[PDB]
Amino acid sequence: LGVLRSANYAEDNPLLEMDHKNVSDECMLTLTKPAEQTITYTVGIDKTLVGAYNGKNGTNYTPFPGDVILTNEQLKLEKGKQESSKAHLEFTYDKNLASAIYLLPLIVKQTIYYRINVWDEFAPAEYTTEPLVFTHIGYIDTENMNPLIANKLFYKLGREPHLSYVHAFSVINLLTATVKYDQSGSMPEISYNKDISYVLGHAKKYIMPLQAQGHKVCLTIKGDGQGIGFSNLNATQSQKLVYDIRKCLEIYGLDGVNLYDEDFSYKKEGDNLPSAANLCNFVTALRQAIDDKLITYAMTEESASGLDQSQNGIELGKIVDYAWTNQFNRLVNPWREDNPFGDDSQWKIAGLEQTKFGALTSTLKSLSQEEGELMEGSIFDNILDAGYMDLANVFVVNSIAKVVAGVETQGATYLLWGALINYDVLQGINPELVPGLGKGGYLDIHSDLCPKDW
Amino acid sequence: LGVLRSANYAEDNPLLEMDHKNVSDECMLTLTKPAEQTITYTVGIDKTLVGAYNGKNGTNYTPFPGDVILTNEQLKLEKGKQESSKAHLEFTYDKNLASAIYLLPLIVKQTIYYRINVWDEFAPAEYTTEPLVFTHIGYIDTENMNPLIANKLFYKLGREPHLSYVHAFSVINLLTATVKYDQSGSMPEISYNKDISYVLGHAKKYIMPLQAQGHKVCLTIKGDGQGIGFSNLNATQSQKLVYDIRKCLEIYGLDGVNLYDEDFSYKKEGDNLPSAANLCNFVTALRQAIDDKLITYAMTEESASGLDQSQNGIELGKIVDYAWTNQFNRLVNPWREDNPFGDDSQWKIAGLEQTKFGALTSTLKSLSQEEGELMEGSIFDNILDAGYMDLANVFVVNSIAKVVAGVETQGATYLLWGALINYDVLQGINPELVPGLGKGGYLDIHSDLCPKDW
């Protein structure tokens, strides 16, 4: 009586994702009672167990026909111990392998059923055109990250025989361009660093493949500290910036623009004071020029007061497509009186439906025990206990970043909160980020999923 | 309106047999009306049609994952012609192909649905453990043939969705050993040529693999023209020959012996003359020694008279498991009076049930128009129109031999008569000899299925 168990996967029938490279796992035997005498059991492959697995679990899998290299298959179990040595399995990818899920059973002489997912050129097996239920907006810092990593990130939704895969993000924000004065000191202009220039300059390689995979790709525009910005433009300056943004979006085939309201370094006293009214007039002008292309707003603590009320009849929430904050790893509910976690009323935008507000914008930082309690607490209490279910439609991730030492814990969770609420809590569907675990996955701190190639 | 058809196969859905080697075929377009103008069409692969084929024909096929190399895919149809050029298709075997029957639809962009049977290491896909209805006995001339060709010959039984494969033979007779006088001329001794010595000396390679797939393997023992044989032995000579045969079967893991009563060159007038009583006495002693191992008898014109009668209370038909004749390509009915084909009364063995008698023994020789009419006539009239149904149990093929120029016609027929009667006539099941057609098949006169390797 024992259990052939996977060392690196809690699933009793682990599902490995094979994206044109080899995959591997170690398996071991776990006896119910300690071994009396030292015995050596051997693991072997028994592909004749496929049809029985299929009939029971409703699957239609085919035996994995590629080379499977089992090393240290002699499971030595020392006397007095309950868990044997670890055999190592490496599944070998070959281009002859068709894209599907395969089944390779392993027997001890219990049984562990390994399922291998051979990906197609663009997506894993069982990818569906069924769209994501919520809006997942992701940032990419073009200084450290390839925008095309979004086309390598998927959710594993459901359990067999109803397994489906979808892209983890629906909108991708590209960081960044900036607003600066021209050389003459009169007009604003958009400045592009070397990295954001290469991505835009080769959009058929970086932006257009994302769009073919169902992504809306926007350009984030921030401030460059010269005192000119979205909230203090005059009439002539505004027409310039609206024209340049309109041109930029059509020029490089972008789907919209993200207005990041920070790093403008506005002056506190003078004639060009930043106002919410100016911000409303500017976005209204931008909406007229770019039509149905997306406008999103990233509110910060440097944002102007008065967005809670109408400015000259304009409500910013009515003109923008989405809006979120820089209050990372915390759920911001501006519509909650006597909010136990904190008063988020400064983040109230007039005319903005709760469905257009990313209440949770997450970043890849390590969090304390109190920070983790506040995060999970503000998430569950506002969406489930307080009834603010309309705050589960937009989830924002400020920079999909490389997982390194220290941020491994937050790296596993800061992309799954959107699907956790919408799929696991609000429905029955289990969500899982793919390719996360395993060598070469996103959670491998010694690998890069989609690295920068310029 | 047109028909995409195969040149070498008249079936709409050709079933190609892939046994760890590549398989190929040519196709063409046949228009229902001549080409008004000169046009060129192109053929392609549409694995989406796999589903509708499955639903219509009740199959569970999966699209073929291997590489299909199509050449001349542009079909040139000159004006006034109804048939386009030929396109060549090669289906590539690879170790990454699991054993199954795969479907590969081919479209002109009518449809030709190709079915690929990727064999396992031992049998084609859809091989069944269901045993053969009749007993098919096959000889193998070890001087020209490898005994393991029997592990490559199958019957394709039925139609889809009720397709199955069985081995075409149940008993294999290995030619041959000889009985000669010892140096002093007082004892019989078994003699082995260089080829039959190698087969027995490496029975783990040649005999045992046949028995694993369910073959009963016997050794045929004839005469060497030295005047000593099964029918003139005394008491001391009989014990010696019985001992060495019992020893031979035990030594090489054989399942029985075939007593071929020919080429002994018995004396016409003298002291130790051949008699049917002597033969009955020797076989009775062989039955006691080898016990449940098989004794079979091949009667010839050189066989002794009186086998129709009980010799000293012994009936040879009671001690032998099977019996047949050397009267090739003609059904022999010794129990039928006023036989229109021929009086076969001299081939009658006392106490032999008809279910143990192989009335038809086939050999790979070309037949005249009259000889073929005698063959088909005697087979059909005796078993079906005269009601000798018990003569359909045992069928014999004397030397499964290489098909060459001149015997292509008899090559296709002389292995399927037993299945034609028992499966096609007496049941609804359709029989096909696999792997017969195609390059490398048994009917390819420029290839050897399982050749000699010694």
Show the 3-state SS of B380-442: HHHHHHCCCHHHHCEEEECCCCCCCCCCHHHHHHCCCHHHHHHHHHCCCCCEEEECCCCCCCC
* Close Cβ partners of B92 (under 8 Å, ≥ 6 residues apart): B22, B66, B67, B68, B69
Q: Which of A243-249's residues contact partners 24+ apart within 8 Å by CB, and which partners? A: A243/A289, A244/A189, A244/A190, A245/A190, A245/A221, A245/A286, A245/A289, A245/A290, A246/A286, A246/A289, A246/A290, A248/A177, A248/A190, A248/A200, A248/A219, A249/A219, A249/A290, A249/A293
Q: Count the Cβ atoms, other than its own, within 10 Å of residue A206.
A: 22
Q: How far is A125 from chain B (nearest CA, A)?
A: 14
Query: Which residues face A113 on adjacent strands?
Result: A105
Q: How far is A94 from chain B (nearest CA, A)?
A: 8
3-state DSSP assignment of residue A101? strand
What token pair was written down for B205? 């390679």
* Close Cβ partners of B280 (under 8 Å, ≥ 6 residues apart): B311, B312, B314, B315, B316, B319
Q: Where in chain A is the domain with CATH 3.20.20.80?
A: 135-434
Of B63, B66, B96, the CB nearest to A66: B96
What token pair was written down for B373? 């009419």
Q: How far is B75 from chain A (nearest CA, A)?
A: 28
Q: How far is A66 from chain B (nearest CA, A)?
A: 5
Is B65 within 8 Å of A94 when comparing Cβ atoms? no
Q: Count the Cβ atoms, other than its own, within 10 Å of residue A182.
A: 11
Query: Which residues face A84 on adjacent strands?
Result: none
Residue B125's φ and ψ, nearest 5 degrees, are: -60, 150
Q: Where in chain A is the domain with CATH 2.60.40.1740?
A: 2-118
Closest residue of B to A95, CA-based?
Answer: B96
Closest residue of A to B63, CA-based?
Answer: A98
Interface of B with A (CB under 8 A): 62-63, 65-67, 94-98, 100
What token pair was written down for B369? 């128009």
Residue A406 and residue A393: Cα distance in Å, rounded?
A: 30
Residue B14 and residue B114: Cα distance in Å, rounded?
A: 5
| Short-list B289, B202, B283, CA closest to B244 | B289
Of A63, A67, A96, the CB nearest to B66: A96
Residues in B touching A67 (Cβ below 8 Å): 95
Q: Count CA atoms within 13 Å of residue A192 on its CB side.
A: 13
Query: Which residues face B55 on adjacent strands?
Result: none
Of A63, A67, A98, the CB nearest to B65: A98
Q: Do A206 and A147 touch, CB atoms closer than 8 A?
A: yes
| Short-list B401, B413, B400, CA closest to B367 | B413
DSSP letter at A384 equals I
| Short-list B412, B434, B420, CA closest to B136 | B420
- Neighbour-count burial of A268, counting CB atoms closer than 10 A to its CB (0-12 exposed, 13-18 middle, 19+ buried): exposed
Which amino acid would we find at residue A389? M
Of A62, A67, A94, the CB nearest to B98: A62
Residues in A touching B95 (Cβ below 8 Å): 65, 67
Q: Which CATH architecture has domain B135-434?
A: Alpha-Beta Barrel (3.20)
Q: How far is A399 from chain B (nearest CA, A)?
A: 40
Closest residue of A to B120, CA-based?
Answer: A65
| Short-list A151, A37, A163, CA closest to A431 | A163
* Fold that domain A2-118 belongs to in CATH: Immunoglobulin-like (2.60.40)
DSSP letter at B8 equals S
Is B98 within 8 Å of A66 when comparing Cβ atoms? no
Closest residue of A to B67, CA-based?
Answer: A96
Q: Count CA atoms within 13 Å of residue A424 on its CB side.
A: 12
* Resolution for this experimental structure (Å): 2.9
Of B62, B67, B98, the CB nearest to A65: B98
3-state DSSP assignment of residue A411? helix
Closest residue of B to A99, CA-based?
Answer: B65
3-state DSSP assignment of residue A49? helix
Residue A432 and residue B154: Cα distance in Å, rounded?
A: 49
Q: Do B334 and B325 touch, CB atoms closer than 8 A?
A: no
Which amino acid would we find at residue A26? E
What token pair was written down for B348? 């009658």
> What is the residue whose two structure tokens read 């071929």?
B260
Is A96 within 8 Å of B97 when comparing Cβ atoms? yes
Residue B208 and residue B49: Cα distance in Å, rounded?
A: 44
Residue A358's φ and ψ, nearest 5 degrees, are: -75, 95
| Short-list A175, A263, A257, A194, CA closest to A226 | A263
Which amino acid would we find at residue B299? M
Is A96 within 8 Å of B94 when comparing Cβ atoms? yes
Q: Do A101 and A57 touch, CB atoms closer than 8 A?
A: no
What token pair was written down for A355? 């469905």
- Neighbour-count burial of A198, counting CB atoms closer than 10 A to its CB (0-12 exposed, 13-18 middle, 19+ buried): middle
Chain breaks in chain B following residues, C–N > 2.5 Å: 109
Contact pairs from chain A to chain B, CB under 8 Å = 21
* Plot region of B302 (φ>0 → left; ψ -120 to 50 → alpha; else → beta): alpha
* Close Cβ partners of B346 (under 8 Å, ≥ 6 residues apart): B334
DSSP letter at B151 equals G
DSSP readout, B313-380? TB-HHHH-SEEEES-BTS---TT-TT-SS---GGG--TT--GGGEE--EE-S----HHHHHHHHHHHH
Tell me the torsion sign for CA atoms A384, A388, A394, A395.
Answer: negative
What token pair was written down for B352? 């032999």
Q: Count CA atoms within 13 Å of residue B199 on its CB side.
A: 30
Interface of A with B (CB under 8 A): 62-63, 65-67, 94, 96-98
Is A65 within 8 Å of B96 when comparing Cβ atoms? yes
What token pair was written down for A270? 């003078």
Q: Do B94 and B116 touch, CB atoms closer than 8 A?
A: no
Residue B148 and residue B168: Cα distance in Å, rounded?
A: 13
Residues in A touching B66 (Cβ below 8 Å): 96
Q: How far is B48 from chain A (nearest CA, A)?
A: 15
3-state DSSP assignment of residue A33? coil
Question: By what technique were these coordinates determined?
Answer: X-ray
Tell me the torsion sign for CA atoms A232, A238, A241, A246.
Answer: positive
Find the helix packing angle between B235-251 and B276-290, rounded to 10°. Answer: 40
User: Best interface-test mutation with A: which of B50, B59, B96, B127 has the largest number of A CBs within 10 A?
Assistant: B96
Is A97 within 8 Å of B65 when comparing Cβ atoms? yes
Closest residue of B to A68, CA-based?
Answer: B96
Q: How far is A161 from chain B (nearest CA, A)?
A: 17
Residue B149 and residue A382: Cα distance in Å, rounded?
A: 76
Residues in A touching B65 (Cβ below 8 Å): 96-98
Of B65, B95, B98, the CB nearest to A63: B98
Q: Which of B235-240's residues contact partners 24+ apart within 8 Å by CB, and which partners? A: B236/B187, B237/B186, B237/B187, B237/B188, B238/B281, B238/B282, B238/B285, B239/B285, B240/B187, B240/B188, B240/B189
Residue B258 and residue B290: Cα distance in Å, rounded?
A: 13
Residues in A touching B67 (Cβ below 8 Å): 96
Of B63, B96, B98, the CB nearest to A94: B96
Percent helix, strand, coil in chain A (nearest 5)? 25, 30, 45
Is A97 within 8 Å of B98 when comparing Cβ atoms? no
Residue A318 and residue A311: Cα distance in Å, rounded?
A: 12
| Short-list A250, A266, A185, A263, CA closest to A221 | A263
Residue B4 and residue B429: Cα distance in Å, rounded?
A: 28
Radius of gyration of chain B (CA): 26
Q: Which of B330-337's residues contact partners 24+ apart within 8 Å by CB, and which partners? A: B330/B360, B330/B374, B330/B375, B330/B378, B331/B359, B331/B360, B331/B375, B331/B378, B331/B379, B331/B382, B331/B383, B331/B391, B332/B359, B332/B360, B333/B359, B333/B378, B333/B382, B333/B386, B333/B388, B333/B391, B335/B388, B336/B382, B336/B386, B336/B388
User: Best interface-test mutation with B: which of A62, A96, A102, A116 has the largest number of B CBs within 10 A?
Assistant: A96
DSSP letter at A307 equals T
Closest residue of A to B100, CA-based?
Answer: A62
Q: Do A389 and A367 touch, CB atoms closer than 8 A?
A: no
What token pair was written down for A277? 């009214």
Residues in B touching A63 (Cβ below 8 Å): 98
Q: Count the Cβ atoms, other than its own, within 10 Å of residue A366.
A: 14
Residue B11 and residue B31: Cα distance in Å, rounded?
A: 17
What token pair was written down for B51? 């589903």
Is B95 within 8 Å of A65 when comparing Cβ atoms? yes
Closest residue of B to A66, CA-based?
Answer: B96
Closest residue of B to A97, CA-based?
Answer: B96
Residues in B touching A54 (Cβ below 8 Å): none
Of B62, B96, B100, the CB nearest to A97: B96
Residues in B touching A65 (Cβ below 8 Å): 95-98
3-state DSSP assignment of residue A216? strand
Residue B395's alpha-carbon distances to A223, B138, B328, B412, B416, in angstroms, are 94, 9, 11, 16, 10
Residues in B touching A98 (Cβ below 8 Å): 63, 65
3-state DSSP assignment of residue B119? coil
DSSP letter at B152 equals T
Residue B221 and residue B242: Cα distance in Å, rounded?
A: 12
Closest residue of A to B94, CA-based?
Answer: A96
Q: Do B77 and B41 touch, CB atoms closer than 8 A?
A: yes
Residue A289's φ and ψ, nearest 5 degrees, are: -85, -40
3-state DSSP assignment of residue B113? strand
Closest residue of A to B60, CA-based?
Answer: A60
* Close Cβ partners of A269 (under 8 Å, ≥ 6 residues apart): none
3-state DSSP assignment of residue A400? coil
Chain breaks in chain A following residues, C–N > 2.5 Å: 109
> What is the residue whose two structure tokens read 């868990």?
A83
Residue B34's alpha-carbon distances to B31, B81, B108, B332, B370, in angstroms, are 7, 5, 17, 54, 43
Closest residue of B to A64, CA-based?
Answer: B98
> What is the residue whose two structure tokens read 């084929």?
B53
